[model samples]
Target: AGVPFNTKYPYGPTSIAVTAMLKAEWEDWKSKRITSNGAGGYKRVQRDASTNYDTVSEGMGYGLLLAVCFNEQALFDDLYRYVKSHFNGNGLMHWHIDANNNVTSHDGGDGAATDADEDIALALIFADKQWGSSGAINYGQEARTLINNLYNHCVEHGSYVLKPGDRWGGSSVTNPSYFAPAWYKVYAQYTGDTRWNQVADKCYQIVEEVKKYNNGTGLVPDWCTASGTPASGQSYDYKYDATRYGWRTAVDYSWFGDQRAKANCDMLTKFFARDGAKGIVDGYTIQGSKISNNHNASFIGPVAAASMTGYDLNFAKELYRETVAVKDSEYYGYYGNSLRLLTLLYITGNFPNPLSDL
Candidate 1:
């Protein structure tokens, strides 16, 4: 619908249809993926045979973001309540929790994931803009507190490098997907702090180093060292966590016209475009080879999102079509569908910077 958001991508569905699809999917997603727990607490669901219907801070972050974006104040408030109910020692939400509202161990310990905290704080900013901080929840105050906590706890003291979680990992051991320069910019603006800008710069520096190890594929590893070497005891490939790099990097370009973000987007687009729409798979090595033949919305949607920043308009349009054409049956998983919804919002121009004017 406008510039700075890339609504010009020739999606097969009309603008109205895209909105309708979001609405329809939101209804189904909420019904199946959100559940109420304790008093005034709502947790995002990851219902599967393996998970046995546990909740994670990652899903709570996604739920709060979608709720605020879709103007569901009640839902947003409840999810925030749930996040508040389960804080780790560092004043951040615990990374994983069971259906019974108990903290549980997850990957890399259970304290907190920096990515979830980032998204949650960003969602609070959106909530403050959408509903104001006059009544019940003071969204602005909460966001500010979380922002400071992120700096004090989640970020390394000297390097300002973002740790994977408040509990474990550090600059030497980081998750590349957790770096979101665009959101860090918003944090800087809201907090009136230039230090967040430094964080953003460090994040960009780390991402560039990681991409160098990608061997020209622009496929960053899920876990890497501060200097870009793959970290030990981690999956050093483009899998579930690494796939998020497409969405995170593309957002910087789409929102602020960052050329670095554009370059990252372009490289990923070219890697996927070589095999056309049909060749997109679920996992890939850093060298651009497919790791899994399975198809899912998680991989497809982000590549479509990344295409928005590239020079190929026809290929971008085709990727858009292919992303939207994913069937509901294949797009039903929690991780894939969450990323799909987010990618759809970005490409369709619905995921606006809630604090852009401020």
Candidate 2:
């Protein structure tokens, strides 16, 4: 039996996102079926064809686990098992797979390549907290190693200036936004590696070079050349760019770009304070146009950042409130539910203490 309540107002998207993360983590841990294919090549097919590993979905899973949900140690164990099994010998993950867990495609670009690494690193950090396990520690360490490799083999002169090929290769300066430095800060702290700090600092410096072209409204171009110039063929859209850069909540040039811009951080603090009742507008504006939406994942990125910095607890609370409002519905089910767990962790500091508990 279930507790009875008014069914009209369902769970919000943000809450649903967090729940999904937790449930997935629980299921993955219970069975140790990390890949889409069941354990030992067994398959229980579902109706939804889209329920396979992809960049955006997988990324949401990782982010929710890292930023919000760290309470369940069993889930963390399952998640680690899954992550370790699928990670290619190189630092990057394969791009596509079928219901049977066969690799379908392998490619790297601004979206999948960069975000996946960030997601894995973030998840590992959270896992370390839950289980006091070195598996999570090793995950962070390996992520740093892979990112460094990407920098050394693919990046040149502190700019992602070289493209090795279609897969896992691109010019760093071409898309300064493509590489996230804030994550590097997390990586360095987790691994105690100064080299990660150096790279993060260098990347932050280069990001500033690209900030010159930010259309005053905070939208960076899709492409920036090696010399810190915005590429010619790029057009700006708040929704599109939000989807592009918001995955990590590393958008908003005025705040993240200046490195010393407390005002930018302050703005972010206020933004997250608003529950989803107030729609989130894209920071990037063109002319007099502002884009806004109820996109829960993008909102989670900034909320996580604010929580990390301890800048706005009210905003974090609001984010939690809003998430539950939108996602707690049967329609959304487990989709995008992980964000709630992460939000809870941030606000309560209730995550398992990795040093002593695990």
Give me the candidate number with maximum TM-score.
Answer: 1
The reply for model 2, stretches above 4 Å from the true place, is 1-74, 106-112, 125-157, 160-182, 189-193, 206-236, 240-261, 267-277, 281-288, 291-297, 300-320, 328-344, 347-358
TM-score of each: 0.91, 0.59
lDDT string, candidate 2, 1-358, tens digits: 0011111111111111143534454443323223334322322111122444332325434533553243544444544444444555455544333455444454332223444455555555655454444743454455456556444444454543433222433443345445545455555565675555565555445445545644333334445555556445554433433333322323222113433322333444444344332465433442224455445543443444333333454554665455444443323322343434333433333332222222
Q: What C-alpha lDDT, on a 0 to 100 scale, does residue 334 get in candidate 2?
A: 29
lDDT of 1: 0.77
Q: Assess candidate 2 and give its TM-score to the true structure.
A: 0.59
- Every candidate's CA RMSD: 3.6, 8.6
What would the per-residue lDDT of candidate 1 be over residues 205-252, giving only the tens digit for each residue? 887887677877778888888898878888888888988888877777
Off by more than 4 A, model 1? 1-17, 37-43, 105-109, 327-332
Collision pairs in model 1: none
